[PDB]
Design a protein around this ligand. Structure first.
Ligand SMILES: [Mg+2]
Ligand SMILES: [Zn+2]
Ligand SMILES: [Zn+2]
Ligand SMILES: [Zn+2]
Lengths: 112, 171, 549, 184, 87, 270, 97
């Protein structure tokens, strides 16, 4: 019911001007806030406390001290994060990068 | 002593070879990188077994240049000495500091300070040889040596052995 | 970059964060570093074997890198070290150590609550380390006296004894760079670094494992500094001028001062000096360490440097917005880009963009020499970098570069397969065109190229709305792809005709506006009528007219 | 590049953990007991001896010559005793090897000169005889490629038997392997 | 520490090629063509490797294979012949 | 803040919506697994209107003089009048339609019928009209069996999640549901033959186009929705040029910050 | 011209990953560095003209790799090491997920 009242209120915010937005977006956001146990806020002390990658959380506001406590408390990083592949300058597992490609040698030979 | 080991190796491949010839070239390049090599991890690579059945599997394309990385699994015959390994061999080089018995692809060395006291040096002969109270050791001589020390260096392995222990020496 | 190395290229899947051990620092450093002087072999334009390159990184386009050399444009720099006269805190971990000394008593050095305490296993429950440590700290913060005998789970009659030592622990709290502790009237004594280190080293193993610490990567005693890692010259550049001028970085100065106060503190040991007069330079060494890592301390210290500079700390380099992370690694000033004033052209299609000649001759694309186009490529190379459909660079397979405005074989040129031809930009090419701010998926779309005169980016009208741009002098940005798969991405994903339907509102985000939108109503009337002569031109203007009157 | 093995582990951070080799059955971590097979089988550690390995590389070069000529477009020469084998190995190697593998030429030389046998069946009965003893494959190899006329000699040249077999029973096998021998 | 090799049966993913899959396939193949690679279609006068890879796709004569990865670490291997290309 | 808060959220390959840790945010994106592009505002005619117009519009009783279709709207219309084996299927249809009306008046308490759904039918009909040129003066060649059993077999194909186990099956039936109601709203055995004379060929063609367009309108695994939603809300927030209760930008600040002490609390008791 | 964070977010929205990797490497920063096997640091002494490497201390000349990352990130890690924080760079993962 909290998520419901939240989405409804936000919808009155956006629709106050009359501008329309497809349900799925707002619903995605409020889902992101509730899917924890309560109301996870959208601020520094809010969501950047979760188990996310140290560098991913590092690229938001607090930064330095996050790397400090990440180095002290021997954190290990998943590297599944978007921003982290961005830092390493690698193919981010994003849409186009969400899969791999291979050459099946059989079909390769069966074209001649 | 010789071993047979299971080995995996990653080979990159340019898009030029993306045809039916591909399965050939890979193998032809593996033998160029694997055969003849040597490292203290798994000794000397000698020969790769079962050319007719070597596994390749599909390979992924590196996402910037069309190259394709393949992981090849194979088996090979290898060999590397150990401490206290008694092996036979034949000398190749020899002088006043000791003789060099060659075994397989590896150069074992034996020092004058390690031979028995009755065995001494003889440079006044061509080719030079170590003369004893009964035996003579020159070049072609068979000697059984017990390897004591092993050294890895770049792409070769050397060793130090002895003939002073009983049941060793010319055979 | 450049120069092949016989090493297997791989990617990154794990990033493990630890803390340097002084044995590792003293096992990785290439030089000892003792001299606090920079360059000049005593007034000799070179380098003193003391700071920046007794062995490590190179300046002035030279070799010398423990035989590594490879010049500046290859060597990453190698790390040095410098010993310490006495242990010194870390600037960011003081907040931690203050809370660790409150969870384990001194003298002995072990946990204050064993498994017999039922609220202790409740902390040892959830495997989340950063919250387990919060629980243990919330527990042992009350115990200001160590323990040895305690009734277990049975009854208060059955006293179970653990490890000995039950001295009172003080109420420790931070002041400046040091710790304060009060033990009838309580007592006060200095909690020196050597005590905290000598006591953390004897903390038990399961205590490490229970406070979120690691056995091999991050131990608590490594929060106290014993040896400092000297960064290589690339971290602390020397932007100078002319030839006989200097210009070292602030980090070189702070490191220098650290070496000075360290030599003073270490000389005060072999010579006669009082206890409470050496520490006046001990807090000075600790100070220069502090401001060297963090000079924006919330405390009183501020630490300038001669020229009134507040000294750019290390954390000042990294914190976001115009900093290492939010300003470099999450956003760079990439090459192959262009920006200019725009104007709308009602004679282009949606996806087209009018690029001026100068930009077309300035921006380049790397094509490969292939039989399908080698006639075209050679034609372009011979058009040169000043007739529009030309080129400006040719790269051989041996990694060699060939300029086209200079050189002498500027008209010769035998293109061989596998070579690369950096050609100009031509029509119907895929580019990434955008207007800032990029608050919208629609704010960057791919465009087909059309090369035109004058210095204005020319774009269709009915594409102003998803870009939100007016022609009162707004500047637009443009990027050029560089691989075949990249331009394929741009053309089959980011194309303008693809992004007509906006997923943010399940609705087309590209209408018909202004002169188009006005007169089209004037045209759509029962009172609007055209007569023959104009009708025919009207029909011809329709490019896909079927030719039927 | 760098050839990796099947038994692959990951000792992170621990940069100092490598046992020292020894004659008393102390081989590297890559040569323990039933090592790991890439198919997923705890396969027994494979060890060969002289002459036998020459046969292994011999079949490998037979499949290498035949398979090497199957695609040469756009029934067996064997027998050979001693020298007519030494001369015949050369052309086969220079046809079906890069030639640069000088280690292969030397290893074949050593594998035919000190070759204890010639027949496959002989070394087969050798493998059944020694493997029936239930000893280490290193011991099966060494006793499979050394000439020890005395149990004291065998116990001397191999500091791994000792209390693994009695002297005279150890002699029992040597008296058989002395007979099982291809006279040159 | 083994393999989540999803068999040919028990195949759950969509039988259609996502615009991202298609995009990266035409991309990679076009690159390889420009890298002087063997082309498996009669070119009929085509010099742009993007267009040539498009023709390779229309006749389903690409030897490539998509590995669709799943969150748990599993993977379904699909061929460019199997995948319907609607879009 | 939004964009850096939602970046690593994308539709994976099982239409789940997870983050860089794989914790599920949604089990199908948008609670329907549908790409927001191919969605259009339609109107389910099962909800609005009186029950009089409802029965007048959807009821077919072969066992009555006034409730059976005129045999001009179907060749077999005169030799079915009274057929009792088919009135079982007609009654099953009308029962299902009424069940829709109850369910959709239950979920959509406003009674609002204009709602965005995939596949625009009221055009897909006119394409059959001008494409096959059916004059509204000849009788259809469709047995009622083709209509009822045809739609019933069509719903089996409109997939969104391919699976085997019961869980994914129910997840699919809940993933569609609301669409099938419009499908039954526009493919009623009356309207199909009364309002727009459909032949058998045009009917199978409409089923084919419906199946295809529906399959097209599904999300593409890989689509980073987190960023899409983030900017989809941040963009209209910029277009805000600002009963006296907090609204607009500052209210939104209160929402995202999640503050206990909002400016205007207030509550509404009915 | 700057390719700020918003320009990144938009390309993440399109899902064009190869364009982003191109824009963050070959189009701007870009660098090749060698990494030791044990310590995930930049200890390797690349003697490219002699195929000699070594990671002294850890004593490793057999198991050493190379990687392509932006030099900006390299400098970042050298700074975090300048504050006594080891970022162990590993090529292979050991956690199933
Ligand atoms: Mg303006
Ligand atoms: Zn160097
Ligand atoms: Zn105590
Ligand atoms: Zn190392």
């Amino acid at each position: 019911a909290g998520r419901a009242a939240l989405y409804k209120e936000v919808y009155n915010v956006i629709a106050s001007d009359g501008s329309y937005v497809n349900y799925r977006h707002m619903a995605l956001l409020v889902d992101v806030m509730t899917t924890q146990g309560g109301l996870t806020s959208v601020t520094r002390h809010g969501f950047n406390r979760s188990n996310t990658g140290a560098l991913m959380r590092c690229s938001f506001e607090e930064t330095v001290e996050i790397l400090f406590e990440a180095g002290a408390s021997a954190e290990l990083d998943d590297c599944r994060g978007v921003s982290e592949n961005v830092i390493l300058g690698q193919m981010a597992p994003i849409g186009t990068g969400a899969f791999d490609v291979m050459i099946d040698e059989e079909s390769l030979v069966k074209y001649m | 002593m010789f071993f047979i080991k299971d080995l995996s190796l990653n080979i990159t491949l340019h898009p030029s070879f993306f045809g039916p010839r591909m399965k050939q070239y890979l193998k032809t390049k593996l033998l160029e990188e694997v055969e003849g090599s040597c490292t203290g991890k798994f000794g000397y690579i000698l020969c790769v077994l079962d050319y007719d059945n070597i596994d390749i599997q599909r390979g992924r394309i590196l996402p910037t240049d069309g190259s394709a990385e393949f992981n090849v699994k194979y088996r090979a015959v290898v060999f590397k000495p150990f401490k206290g390994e008694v092996v036979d061999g034949t000398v190749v080089s020899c002088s006043q500091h000791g003789f060099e018995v060659q075994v397989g692809p590896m150069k074992v060395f034996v020092t004058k300070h390690l031979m028995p006291q009755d065995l001494t040096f003889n440079a006044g002969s061509n080719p030079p040889s170590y003369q004893s109270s009964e035996d003579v050791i020159t070049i072609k001589s068979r000697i059984r040596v017990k390897i004591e020390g092993c050294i890895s260096q770049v792409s070769s392995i050397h060793a130090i052995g002895s003939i002073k222990e009983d049941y060793l020496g010319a055979i | 970059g450049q120069q092949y190395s016989s090493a297997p290229l791989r990617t990154v899947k794990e990033v493990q964060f630890g803390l340097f051990s002084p044995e590792e620092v003293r096992a990785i450093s290439v030089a000892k570093i003792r001299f606090p002087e920079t360059m000049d072999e005593t007034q000799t334009r070179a380098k003193i074997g003391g700071l920046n390159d007794p062995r490590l990184g190179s300046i002035d386009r030279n070799l010398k890198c423990q035989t590594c050399q490879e010049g500046m444009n290859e060597c990453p720099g190698h790390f040095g070290h410098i010993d310490l006269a006495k242990p010194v805190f870390h600037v960011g971990f003081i907040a931690k150590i203050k809370k660790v000394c409150e969870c384990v008593c001194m003298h002995c050095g072990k946990l204050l609550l064993d498994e017999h305490n039922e609220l202790m296993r409740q902390a040892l429950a959830i495997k989340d380390s950063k919250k387990r440590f919060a629980a243990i700290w919330t527990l042992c913060k009350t115990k200001m006296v160590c323990e040895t005998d305690v009734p277990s789970e049975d009854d208060p009659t059955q006293l179970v004894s653990r490890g000995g030592c039950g001295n009172t622990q003080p109420t420790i709290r931070k002041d400046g760079l040091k710790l304060v502790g009060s033990w009838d009237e309580p007592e006060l004594r200095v909690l020196s670094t050597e005590e905290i280190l000598n006591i953390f080293k004897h903390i038990s193993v399961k205590d490490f494992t229970s406070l979120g610490f690691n056995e091999v990567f991050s131990r608590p005693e490594w929060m106290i500094l014993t040896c400092l890692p000297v960064p290589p010259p690339p971290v602390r550049p020397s932007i100078s001028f002319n030839e006989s001028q200097r210009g070292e970085d602030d980090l070189t100065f702070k490191l220098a001062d650290i070496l000075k106060a360290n030599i003073s503190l270490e000389t005060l040991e072999h010579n006669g000096a009082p206890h409470h007069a050496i520490e006046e330079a001990e807090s000075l060494l600790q100070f220069h360490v502090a401001t060297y890592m963090d000079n924006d301390i919330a405390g009183q210290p501020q630490a300038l440097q001669k020229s009134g500079r507040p000294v750019k700390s290390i954390r000042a380099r990294l914190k976001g917005k115009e900093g290492r992370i939010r300003g470099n690694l999450m956003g760079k000033r990439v090459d192959f880009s262009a920006r200019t004033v725009i104007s709308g052209d009602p004679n282009l299609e949606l996806d087209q963009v009018g690029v001026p000649k100068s930009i077309a001759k300035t921006l380049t694309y790397p094509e490969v020499v292939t039989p399908y186009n080698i006639d075209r490529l050679t034609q372009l190379v011979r058009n040169g970098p000043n007739e529009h459909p030309g080129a400006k660079y040719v790269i051989r397979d041996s990694g060699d570069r060939i300029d086209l405005r200079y050189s002498k074989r500027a008209g010769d040129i035998q293109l061989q397969y596998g070579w690369k031809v950096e050609r100009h930009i031509m029509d119907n090419d895929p580019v990434l065109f955008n207007r800032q701010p990029s608050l919208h998926k629609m704010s960057m779309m791919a465009h087909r190229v059309k090369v035109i005169p004058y210095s204005t980016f020319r774009l269709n009208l009915s594409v102003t709305s998803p870009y939100n741009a007016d022609f009162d002098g707004d500047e637009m940005n443009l990027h050029v792809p560089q691989s075949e798969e990249t331009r394929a991405e741009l053309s089959q994903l980011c194309a303008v005709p693809l992004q007509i339907v906006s997923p943010q509102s399940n609705k087309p985000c590209m209408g018909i506006v202004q002169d188009t939108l006005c007169g089209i109503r004037k045209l759509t009337l029962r009172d609007t009528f055209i007569e023959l002569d104009q009708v025919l031109n009207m029909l011809y203007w329709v490019p896909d007219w079927d030719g039927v009157i | 590049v760098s050839t990796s093995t099947f038994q692959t582990r990951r000792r992170r951070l621990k940069k100092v953990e490598e046992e020292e080799n020894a004659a008393t059955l102390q081989l590297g971590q890559e040569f323990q007991l039933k090592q790991i097979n890439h198919q997923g089988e705890e396969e027994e550690l494979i060890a060969l001896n002289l002459s036998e390995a020459r046969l292994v590389i011999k079949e490998a070069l037979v499949e290498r010559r035949r398979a090497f000529k199957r695609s040469q477009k756009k029934d067996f020469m064997h027998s050979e005793t001693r020298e007519k084998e030494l001369e015949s190995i050369d052309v086969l190697l220079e046809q079906t090897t890069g030639g640069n593998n000088k280690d292969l030429k030397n290893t074949m030389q050593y594998l035919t000169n000190f070759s204890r046998f010639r027949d496959q069946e002989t070394v087969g009965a050798v493998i059944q005889l020694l493997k029936s003893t239930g000893l280490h494959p290193f011991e099966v190899a060494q006793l499979g490629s050394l000439a020890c006329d005395t149990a004291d000699e065998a116990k001397t040249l191999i500091p791994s038997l000792n209390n693994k077999i009695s002297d005279d029973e150890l002699e029992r096998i040597l008296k058989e392997l002395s007979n099982l021998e291809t006279l040159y | 520490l083994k393999e989540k090799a999803i068999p040919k049966d028990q195949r759950a993913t969509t039988p259609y090629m996502t615009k991202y899959e298609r995009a990266r396939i035409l991309g990679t193949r076009a690159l390889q063509i420009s890298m002087n690679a063997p082309v498996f279609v009669d070119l009929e006068g085509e010099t742009d490797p993007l267009r040539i890879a498009m023709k390779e796709l229309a006749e389903k004569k690409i030897p490539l294979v998509i590995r669709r990865y799943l969150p748990d670490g599993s993977f379904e291997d699909w061929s460019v012949e199997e995948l319907i290309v609607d879009l | 803040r939004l964009v850096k808060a939602l970046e690593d959220i994308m539709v994976h390959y099982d239409n789940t919506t997870r983050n860089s840790l794989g914790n599920v945010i949604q089990f199908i994106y948008g609670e329907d697994g549908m790409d927001a592009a191919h969605i259009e505002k339609q109107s389910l005619d099962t909800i609005g209107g009186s029950d009089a117009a409802f029965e007048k519009r959807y009821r077919v009783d072969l066992l009555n003089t006034d409730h059976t279709l005129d045999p001009s709207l179907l060749e077999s219309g005169s030799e079915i009048l009274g057929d009792l084996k088919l009135q079982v299927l007609l009654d099953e249809e009308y029962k299902q339609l009424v069940k829709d009306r109850k369910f959709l008046r239950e979920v959509f308490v406003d009674g609002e019928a204009n709602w965005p759904l995939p596949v625009n039918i009221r055009r897909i009909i006119q394409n059959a009209q001008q494409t096959f040129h059916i004059d509204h003066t000849k009788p259809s060649d469709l047995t009622i069996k083709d209509i009822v059993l045809g739609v019933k077999d069509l719903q089996e194909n409109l997939l969104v999640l391919r699976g085997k186990n019961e869980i994914i099956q129910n997840a699919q039936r809940d993933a569609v549901t609301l669409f099938c109601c419009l499908l039954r709203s526009r493919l009623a055995t009356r309207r199909v033959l009364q309002e727009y004379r459909l032949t058998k060929q045009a009917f199978d063609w409409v089923l084919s186009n419906i199946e295809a367009q529906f399959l097209r309108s599904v999300v593409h695994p890989g689509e980073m929705v987190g960023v899409l939603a983030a900017q989809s809300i941040g963009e209209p927030a910029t277009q805000m040029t600002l009963k006296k209760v907090t609204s607009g930008v500052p209210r939104l600040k209160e929402i995202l910050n999640v503050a206990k002490n909002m400016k205007t609390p207030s509550l509404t008791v009915y | 011209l700057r390719f700020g964070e918003m320009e990144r977010d938009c390309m993440i929205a399109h899902g064009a990953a190869s364009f982003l990797k191109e824009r963050l490497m070959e189009a701007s920063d870009a660098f090749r560095v060698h990494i030791c096997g044990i310590c995930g640091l930049m200890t390797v002494i690349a003697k490219l003209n002699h195929n000699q490497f070594e990671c002294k201390g850890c004593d490793n000349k057999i198991d050493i790799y190379q990687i392509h990352i932006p030099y900006a990130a390299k400098l970042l890690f050298q700074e975090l090491m300048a504050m006594n924080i080891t970022p162990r760079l590993y090529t292979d993962r050991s956690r199933d997920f």
